[PDB]
Design a protein around this ligand. Structure first.
Ligand SMILES: CCCCCCCCCCCCCCCCCC(=O)OC[C@H](COP(=O)([O-])OCC(O)COP(=O)([O-])OC[C@@H](COC(=O)CCCCCCCCCCCCCCCCC)OC(=O)CCCCCCCCCCCCCCCCC)OC(=O)CCCCCCCCCCCCCCCCC
Ligand SMILES: CCCCCCCCCCCCCCCCCC(=O)OC[C@H](COP(=O)([O-])OCC(O)COP(=O)([O-])OC[C@@H](COC(=O)CCCCCCCCCCCCCCCCC)OC(=O)CCCCCCCCCCCCCCCCC)OC(=O)CCCCCCCCCCCCCCCCC
Ligand code: BCL
Ligand code: BCL
Ligand SMILES: CC[C@H]1c2cc3[nH]c4c(c3C)C(=O)[C@H](C(=O)OC)c4c3nc(cc4[nH]c(cc(n2)[C@@H]1C)c(C(C)=O)c4C)[C@@H](C)[C@@H]3CCC(=O)OC/C=C(/C)CCC[C@H](C)CCC[C@H](C)CCCC(C)C
Ligand SMILES: CC[C@H]1c2cc3[nH]c4c(c3C)C(=O)[C@H](C(=O)OC)c4c3nc(cc4[nH]c(cc(n2)[C@@H]1C)c(C(C)=O)c4C)[C@@H](C)[C@@H]3CCC(=O)OC/C=C(\C)CCC[C@H](C)CCC[C@H](C)CCCC(C)C
Ligand SMILES: CCCCCC/C=C\CCCCCCCCCC(=O)O[C@H](COC(=O)CCCCCCCCCCCCCCC)COP(=O)(O)OC[C@@H](O)CO
Ligand SMILES: CCCCCC/C=C\CCCCCCCCCC(=O)O[C@H](COC(=O)CCCCCCCCCCCCCCC)COP(=O)(O)OC[C@@H](O)CO
Ligand SMILES: COC(C)(C)C/C=C/C(C)=C/C=C/C(C)=C/C=C/C(C)=C/C=C\C=C(C)\C=C\C=C(C)\C=C\C=C(C)\C=C\CC(C)(C)OC
Ligand SMILES: [Ca+2]
Ligand SMILES: [Ca+2]
Ligand SMILES: [Ca+2]
Ligand SMILES: [Ca+2]
Ligand SMILES: [Ca+2]
Ligand SMILES: [Fe+3]
Lengths: 255, 318, 280, 311, 57, 56, 58, 56
């Protein structure tokens, strides 16, 4: 006989039911960081009103860290952290302007969270990211230049210093930072590989992010032979601030 | 200018990693690892070692038999003439049994080799599935890969096994060959009245496109924050860094919402898996439930209508 | 509203055009100059699509006008109009919507560039999005231009554009044999495998078996070395995924760009250069 | 590789994508390669009929002697210009049928007359001459025989496919669709007429044979599928072009030519005119069309020869 | 003629891997040989011996 | 004609890898040869010798 | 006419890497040449010489 | 030229040998395959006799 309902139509409707359930599942997972939202509705409600949208936040999950590193929970209540900036306009949706010298403000592309003050570890439990002085089993791959001894230049072509060592990932072998002995103050600062272009024939490392004189203020390591997560983010964020702050033209606009 | 983190400019080397130790009962790994400088320009320079126990050994044996049965028949189909085998390679194939044999085991001379290649590739794949499960178990990892692999195996099984059995004939399965399996794809759509109007075909396309959309988005996002260590997603997930924060804000500011460093991989996981889930269902319903997808789409009110600017007299009516 | 960590990133400047004039957010969305411009192109295009649905192909009173979501179709002009502008009711509406879409798409990408400048992040995402835009522009601009009529563009209809794809494909008898098309599909398929592999591995090491700690980079490398004897690496897997997705888009554009402008016969017959080589 | 711009033609409604593309330079050289031989001057149509002047005229009975002679001159240029009259005639005896080419040619006259008079649903008023197929060659360049395909070892049955074959326009589809469909009359339709399964036993392998035939048809006329189909519904006559109706009759026309005109000549044709299976060189779409949508780009040759029509 | 020091082969090839590879090889060979013969005149399942059971219905 | 110092080849080529490769090559070669012969007139399985076993 | 110092070739090329390559090449060339010959009139398997063994059973 | 021997001061003797050996084998295979594709084919030319005919 004939029927309007058929199995293809039944099954496709069943898929939509599954799919929309999946979307709500995924949107719940998406809210394990950064939520509840910082709004002006939560300010005026005296905190009574938490902005979370739909769906609401999931029940917290736990991450068990190896080597007795502790437990991470998600979502989590995070203490508000002051913003080192003042609004360009008091109207909602206005940007803010960094206080003081922008490079040193910790705001905008110079900003970063406060990551943990411990070192990422290898499976065996050693500090993962270390200089080649310490991980003596590492070498430069034949065919490529040794960055040690290369000259570090800033965005304006001025000599910022010399590469004094190379910091490698012991878990998954690669250069993560160059160690730069800064000419101006003889301090040794990290330089992320993400901000480094090699000019191999010149044996020069070019850093477009900052000027030569900006190298004096790269955040410094508490311990010269290892790097904490906290210090990794502070280092990378300082170079990144230069992308917007290091010269006047970088503010924009084009027209 | 800036470093884009596409190629590794300066590779470093260390003695090869033998791998995380596995529990008792796993076999020792085999192979002496080597380094490729050129693989090391785009990714990891180490090749090897590899694990190979009974599951993978049985899998590879089934798989080599299956692949050789295919190639042998291809070479036989140009009468052992190796030059004509190279000339015609993309056209050659191993053809399913004729429809007259139904689901019975067909003769060696006319379809038996296809059924054997199909049986042993299928067993080879099923054993490879177990391999993906066991390698995660030995490392203490969850089974996300084997779940996604099962979804691909489902689609594979529907194409060559489930649907042909449902339809009562190995002749409705897929031939083994490059261009021959493209013929099968086009002929399947023709026979079943235009696969574009199969709604699970439409969904499967949405998810295949979405996989490229999502990996372009995610791939590009991570490289742009790799300057902040964003490629190290384990510690960005447990200890959110400015990499994970800047990534979410790029997307939040672009399109109004965002996910997390962990949950993008869930979006990615489901998008890819649903590509082959919907594909299996679409093929599973073709011939078994719906014989003409266009007329099925007409029936449910979906097919567009156009002004008539061409038309043809049906000579079967006259 | 803002993410609980967002306020410290909402910095002034980094615009390409506009400066202080449009430098503000609207809820989560950043606007800026290309936000304003893109919004106008988008709302116009969407409203003109709905107007085309309202009047249909032959007027709102005909039986062909429909708001059925699968059946709504706004079509390009007849090929006889060449590279000229057709009347609004004879495909010109499609032509204006196309320009809105291109303007909407390009404005979206440039807005993304301004966002990257604010966040001090790389420009990979707008660069990658440019490949999708390029493919759209190959479809509605370059390929129609090389063949001499905007009417070679595809219609804007959820199912009607599949009819366009179908009939354009079968103009070449057996479109599956397009070499750039085969290559592009290989990239589309390989991308999907790679995406499922990547998603699975990250979820499986951060969500290990009960009682297990979070797994390590060493687990990730070991895991695929154990299965396939090779691990590309956690950075390189993101390199690979971007390469596969962009390659799929690029060869898509190539495969349709050569279908008409650079090849007019069946696609299987293209392979006769191989068959006719003096080796066999 | 080809260079833009191509020639283009719109076939269907705007945006449906039914469009034809061709290379302008190849079209110009094809037009040069499909020139029609200029028709002979008209002859006096008076005097006695050929039926009463000559001794063994069985087909061209009602032509005047002038129109009959004119026809013999024409067929010589169309079929055997290098050899001349004696390609079909015993020297010194025009009436004798004791040479195989004359016996064949007599049936060819009936073939053409049947085509020009009875198959206008196909050949319209344009019609065909000997030249349409022969092109100045006794043996048509684009005749065909059943194709045995590549050699197999004795313990493996040939598949009839999965091979690079020009006959299906270099697809790996079943590479001999001519024998089952343009000689024999196997069913070409496979698309179902109901949405839901239950009443269509056609098979995927039948779809591949049909698809292979359509490559050959398309390739023989130099067109894409959209010349005759809207490919969102290949089976739907209401969305097809009138060329599909024409193609339907042409398939039956081709079947009539091979079964009733060519095949009965097999025993009198020399072995050189036969394929490995003993079958005679015979007729497909390519034989007349020769990669043009109309033979000779639609040149009207038959109309200047009254002897090329029935009664 | 077997060699008296043949046992020293297990000083060369790993006994466990040999065992694993033989088991794997023989499972494949067993399935492969059964299937080849089923695709020939020797087939014992569809030979209607001792009877055809599809005809009793 | 063989050399008296031919045993020194095991100072050059690893005995372990050579043995594994030999049995792998011989097993694959033997499968291949059985395949070739079955696909020819020499087929001993489908030759109906001593009898055809497919009864009506 | 070979050179007296030709043995010095094993000072330049690794004898081990050379021996494995020759074995692999010779195996493949042997397989390749056998197949080419089988594809021609020279076929010694399907030539029904001395007799055709399938006729014996059909 | 008298100083041509210095070419081995510029180009690695070991890779050049390997490249020459690799190139010559492929070329030899290529040329045989080309000639066997033409009228010059000496294998399927039924010369001195057709052996398949000998078996019919
Ligand atoms: C013929 C078939 C041939 C197949 C051949 C295959 C060959 C292999 C054969 C062997 C197979 C063995 C299978 C596994 C064995 C045991 C594995 C194991 O370790 O188990 C313990 C395992 C681990 O325990 P655990 O403590 O959770 O550990 C998790 C980790 O800590 C870490 O976990 P986590 O934190 O990552 O979370 C896990 C994850 C869980 O995800 C998975 O693990 C499974 C993923 C799915 C795979 C299958 C695809 C499903 C396709 C559905 C679409 C079909 C269309 C029709 C729709 C019908 C549904 C209505 O969480 C989610 O993703 C949540 C998903 C929510 C589902 C969607 C949400 C909406 C549901 C409906 C909403 C309400 C509807 C109305 C709403 C109204 C308002 C809108 O137990 C689980 O809880 C996970 C279950 C997964 C295993 C079984 C399912 C996957 C494997 C089979 C897939 C087969 C695909 C074929 C589909 C065919 C077409 C339909
Ligand atoms: C519903 C959205 C409205 C929710 C709402 O109340 O928003 C008010 C909210 C304000 O409330 P509030 O006090 O800030 O509260 C915070 C919210 O609750 C914040 O709460 P929340 O963060 O929970 O809310 C996020 C919400 C708000 O987000 C937005 O504002 C944008 C919403 C766009 C939605 C896009 C949906 C796309 C759907 C496409 C259709 C196809 C579907 C899939 C088909 C099959 C494909 C496989 O976005 C969504 O809920 C939708 C996100 C999920 C979409 C999933 C789409 C999946 C498609 C399939 C993909 C394949 C997956 C494979 C697995 O935001 C606004 O007022 C927006 C203002 C509008 C500005 C427009 C002008 C912008 C100018 C620049 C741009 C120019 C263009
Ligand atoms: C009509 C064509 C002829 C024929 C013509 C030839 C000719 C001509 C030759 C062969 C040779 C060989 N043939 Mg044949 N061959 C025929 C039919 C067959 C059939 C078959 C099922 O019908 C088989 C399985 C074989 C098999 C073989 C191999 C034994 C050998 C090549 C091995 C190789 O490449 O080593 C490569 C591996 C290495 C170089 C590594 C080092 C060698 C090791 C140390 C020794 C291995 C065993 C050795 C090959 C023994 C050869 C002994 C006899 C002379 C056969 N022939 C038919 C009847 N065959 C070749 C041969 O005899 O070579 C000496 C050869 O020149
Ligand atoms: C007209 C058709 C002729 C014919 C015409 C020719 C001609 C002409 C030539 C060959 C050449 C070759 N032919 Mg032929 N050939 C025919 C039939 C055959 C058949 C066959 C199954 O019918 C086979 C297998 C071969 C095989 C071969 C090789 C022996 C040789 C290519 C070696 C090479 O590439 O070295 C490349 C590798 C290297 C240079 C590496 C360095 C040295 C190596 C390590 C030592 C190799 C030893 C060498 C092969 C010894 C053989 C010399 C003999 C005089 C044959 N010929 C027919 C009968 N053939 C070539 C030749 O004789 O070369 C001297 C050549 O120029
Ligand atoms: C989300 C859907 C997508 C998807 C998912 C998917 N596929 C998967 C997985 C997942 C999650 C796996 O875990 C699995 C895998 O292991 O990937 C790393 C797999 C896989 N997907 C594969 C392919 C694949 N996936 C495809 C598609 C897709 N996969 C999707 C689009 C396709 C397409 C597009 O058609 C292909 C071709 C394989 C790479 C792998 C399954 C491998 C497998 O089953 O292997 C056993 C089979 C064999 C034939 C083994 C043969 C052995 C080889 C010939 C090696 C020979 C070795 C020998 C020792 C050499 C000795 C010689 C000496 C001389 C040295
Ligand atoms: C290049 C590899 C792949 C890719 C990557 C890519 N796409 C991207 C990005 C990247 C990197 C973004 O950053 C960007 C984004 O922000 O995503 C969330 C985007 C995006 N890719 C999108 C879509 C998408 N990408 C696709 C494909 C692909 N994108 C690739 C295969 C497709 C396919 C295959 O069809 C679509 C559907 C959007 C989600 C988003 C861009 C959003 C945007 O530009 O918003 C402004 C425009 C509107 C809101 C609508 C404009 C309306 C028009 C004015 C009128 C409509 C005209 C239209 C032509 C009609 C079409 C009708 C019918 C066809 C149904
Ligand atoms: C390329 C070949 C790499 C290779 O062959 O590397 C070998 C190791 O192989 C090994 O682990 C095994 C190496 C196998 C892995 C090779 C690559 C497999 C494919 C990886 C790519 C992903 C596949 C597709 C996934 C989507 C080299 O070691 P041996 O062979 O032991 O020789 C060294 C002896 O001297 C030992 O003393
Ligand atoms: C459509 C939007 C519907 C939801 C309304 C909404 O939610 O939009 C609101 C603002 O409306 C706004 O911009 C104001 C919108 C301006 C245009 C409204 C025209 C009014 C004419 C009188 C919230 O966005 P923001 O102020 O950016 O951030 C929120 C935080 O600062 C405080 O919570
Ligand atoms: C001579 O060659 C040598 C030996 C040198 C090696 C060379 C090999 C080569 C070149 C091989 C080339 C292979 C190629 C090009 C293969 C291409 C394959 C493609 C594109 C395949 C695509 C799709 C195929 C599919 C989807 C097939 C699916 C089939 C299935 C699932 C069949 C299952 C059958 C089963 C489970 C049978 C069971 C038997 C039962 C139990 C029913 O018995 C009664
Ligand atoms: Ca086929
Ligand atoms: Ca029995
Ligand atoms: Ca026997
Ligand atoms: Ca013999
Ligand atoms: Ca010869
Ligand atoms: Fe990732």
């Amino acid at each position: 006989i004939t029927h309007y309902i058929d199995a293809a139509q039944i099954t496709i409707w069943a898929f939509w039911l599954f799919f929309f359930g999946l979307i709500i599942y995924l949107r719940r997972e998406d809210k394990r960081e950064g939520y509840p939202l910082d709004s002006d509705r939560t300010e005026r409600s005296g905190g009574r009103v938490k902005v979370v949208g739909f769906p609401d936040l999931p029940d917290p999950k736990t991450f068990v860290l190896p080597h007795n590193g502790g437990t991470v929970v998600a979502p989590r209540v995070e203490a508000p952290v002051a913003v080192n900036a003042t609004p360009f306009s008091p109207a909602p949706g206005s940007p803010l302007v960094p206080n003081g010298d922008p490079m040193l403000s910790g705001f905008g592309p110079a900003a970063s969270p406060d990551r943990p003050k411990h070192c990422d570890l290898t499976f065996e439990g050693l500090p993962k990211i270390v200089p080649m002085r310490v991980a003596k089993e590492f070498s430069i791959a034949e065919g490529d230049p040794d960055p040690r001894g290369m000259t570090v230049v800033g965005l304006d072509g001025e000599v910022a210093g010399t590469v004094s060592d190379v910091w490698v990932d012991r878990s998954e072998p690669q250069i993560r930072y160059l160690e730069v002995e800064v000419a101006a103050n003889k301090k040794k600062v990290l330089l992320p590989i993400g901000f480094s272009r090699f000019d191999k024939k010149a044996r020069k490392v070019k850093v477009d992010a900052i000027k030569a004189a900006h190298f004096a203020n790269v955040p410094t390591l508490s311990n010269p032979d290892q790097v904490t997560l906290y210090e990794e983010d502070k280092v990378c964020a300082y170079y990144a601030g230069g992308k917007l702050y290091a010269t006047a033209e970088r503010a924009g606009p084009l027209l | 200018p800036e470093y884009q983190n596409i190629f590794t400019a300066v590779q470093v080397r260390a003695p090869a990693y033998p791998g995380v130790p596995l529990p008792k009962g796993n076999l020792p790994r085999i192979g002496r690892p080597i380094f490729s400088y050129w693989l090391g320009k785009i990714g990891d320079a180490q090749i090897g070692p590899i694990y190979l126990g009974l599951t993978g050994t049985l899998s590879i044996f089934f798989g080599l038999v299956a692949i050789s049965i295919i190639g042998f028949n291809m070479l036989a189909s140009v009468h052992w003439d190796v030059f004509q085998f190279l000339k015609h390679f993309f056209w050659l194939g191993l053809e399913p049994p004729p429809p007259q044999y139904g689901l019975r085991i067909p003769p060696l001379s006319e379809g038996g080799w296809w059924l054997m290649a199909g049986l042993f590739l299928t067993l080879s794949i099923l054993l490879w599935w177990v391999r993906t499960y066991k390698r995660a178990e030995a490392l203490g990892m969850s089974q996300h890969l084997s779940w996604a692999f099962a979804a691909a195996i489902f689609f594979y099984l529907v194409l060559g096994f489930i649907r042909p059995v449902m339809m009562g004939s190995w002749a409705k399965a897929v031939p083994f060959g490059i261009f021959p399996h493209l013929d099968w794809t086009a002929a399947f759509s023709i026979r079943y009245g235009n696969l574009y109007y199969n709604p699970f075909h439409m969904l499967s396309i949405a998810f295949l496109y979405g996989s490229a959309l999502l990996f372009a988005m995610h791939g590009a996002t991570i490289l742009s924050v790799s300057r902040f260590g964003g490629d190290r997603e384990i510690d960005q997930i447990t200890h959110r860094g400015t990499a994970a924060e800047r990534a979410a804000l790029f997307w939040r500011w672009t399109m109004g919402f965002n996910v997390t460093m962990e949950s993008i991989h869930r979006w990615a996981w489901w998008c890819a898996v649903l590509t082959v889930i919907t594909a299996g269902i679409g093929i599973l319903l073709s011939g078994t439930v719906v014989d003409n997808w266009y007329l099925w789409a007409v029936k449910h009110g979906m097919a567009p209508a156009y002004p008539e600017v061409v038309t043809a007299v049906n000579p079967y009516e006259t | 509203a803002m993410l609980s960590f967002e306020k410290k990133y909402r910095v002034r400047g980094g615009t390409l055009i506009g400066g202080d004039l449009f430098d503000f957010w609207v809820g989560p969305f950043y606007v800026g100059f290309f936000g304003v411009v893109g919004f106008c192109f988008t709302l116009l295009g969407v409203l003109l699509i709905v107007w085309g649905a309202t009047i249909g192909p032959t007027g709102p009173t005909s039986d062909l006008q429909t708001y059925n979501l699968w059946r709504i179709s706004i079509a390009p002009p007849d090929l006889s109009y060449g590279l000229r502008m057709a009347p609004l009711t004879e495909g010109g509406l499609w032509q204006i919507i196309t320009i809105c879409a291109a303007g909407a798409f390009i404005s979206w990408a440039l807005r993304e560039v301004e966002i990257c400048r604010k966040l001090g992040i790389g420009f990979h995402v707008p660069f990658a999005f440019s490949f999708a835009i390029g493919a759209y522009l190959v479809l509605v601009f370059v390929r129609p231009l090389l063949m001499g009529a905007w009417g070679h563009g595809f219609p804007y209809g959820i199912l009607s554009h599949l009819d366009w794809v179908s009939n354009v494909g079968y103009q070449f008898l057996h479109f599956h044999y397009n070499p750039a098309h085969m290559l592009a599909i290989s990239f589309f398929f390989t991308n999907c495998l790679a995406l499922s592999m990547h998603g699975s591995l990250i979820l499986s090491v951060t969500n290990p078996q009960k009682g297990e700690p979070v797994k390590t980079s060493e687990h990730e490398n070991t895991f695929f070395r154990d299965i396939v004897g090779y691990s590309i690496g956690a950075l390189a897997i993101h390199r690979l995924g971007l390469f596969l997705a962009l390659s799929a888009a690029f060869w898509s554009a190539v495969c349709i760009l050569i279908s008409g402008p650079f090849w007019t016969r069946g696609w299987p017959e293209w392979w006769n250069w191989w068959l006719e080589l003096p080796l066999w | 590789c080809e260079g833009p711009p191509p020639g283009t033609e719109q076939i269907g409604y705007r945006g449906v994508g039914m469009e034809n593309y061709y290379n302008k330079r190849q079209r110009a050289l094809s037009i040069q390669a499909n020139q029609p031989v200029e028709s002979l001057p008209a002859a006096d149509s008076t005097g006695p009929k050929a039926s009463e002047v000559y001794q063994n005229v069985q087909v061209l009975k009602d032509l005047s002697v002038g129109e009959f002679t004119r026809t013999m001159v024409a067929v010589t240029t169309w079929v055997s210009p290098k050899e001349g009259c004696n390609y079909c005639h015993v020297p010194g005896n025009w009436a004798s049928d004791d040479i195989y080419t004359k016996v064949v040619s007599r049936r060819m006259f009936e073939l053409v007359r049947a085509a020009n008079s009875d198959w206008k649903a196909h050949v319209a008023e344009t019609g065909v001459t000997c030249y349409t197929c022969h092109r100045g060659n006794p043996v048509p360049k684009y005749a065909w025989v059943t194709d045995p395909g590549p050699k197999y070892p004795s313990g493996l049955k040939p598949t009839g496919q999965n091979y690079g074959s020009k006959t299906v326009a270099y697809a790996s589809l079943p590479f001999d669709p001519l024998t089952p469909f343009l000689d024999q009359a196997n069913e070409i339709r496979i698309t179902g007429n109901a949405a839901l399964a239950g009443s269509n036993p056609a098979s995927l392998k039948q779809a591949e044979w049909t698809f292979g035939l359509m490559m050959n048809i398309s390739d023989s006329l130099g067109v894409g599928c959209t010349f005759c189909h809207n490919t969102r519904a290949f089976n739907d006559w209401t969305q097809s072009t009138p060329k599909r109706t024409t193609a339907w009759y042409a398939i039956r026309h081709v079947r009539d030519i091979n079964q009733n005109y060519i095949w009965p000549l097999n025993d009198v044709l020399p072995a050189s005119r036969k394929g490995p299976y003993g079958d005679p060189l015979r007729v497909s779409c390519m034989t007349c069309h020769q990669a043009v949508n109309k033979p000779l780009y639609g040149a009207q040759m038959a109309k200047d020869y009254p002897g090329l029509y029935k009664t | 003629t077997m060699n008296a020091n043949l046992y020293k082969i297990w000083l060369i090839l790993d006994p466990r891997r040999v065992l694993v590879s033989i088991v794997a090889f023989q499972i494949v060979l067993g399935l492969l040989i059964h299937m080849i013969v089923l695709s020939t005149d020797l087939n014992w399942l569809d030979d209607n011996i001792p009877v055809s059971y599809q005809a009793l219905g």
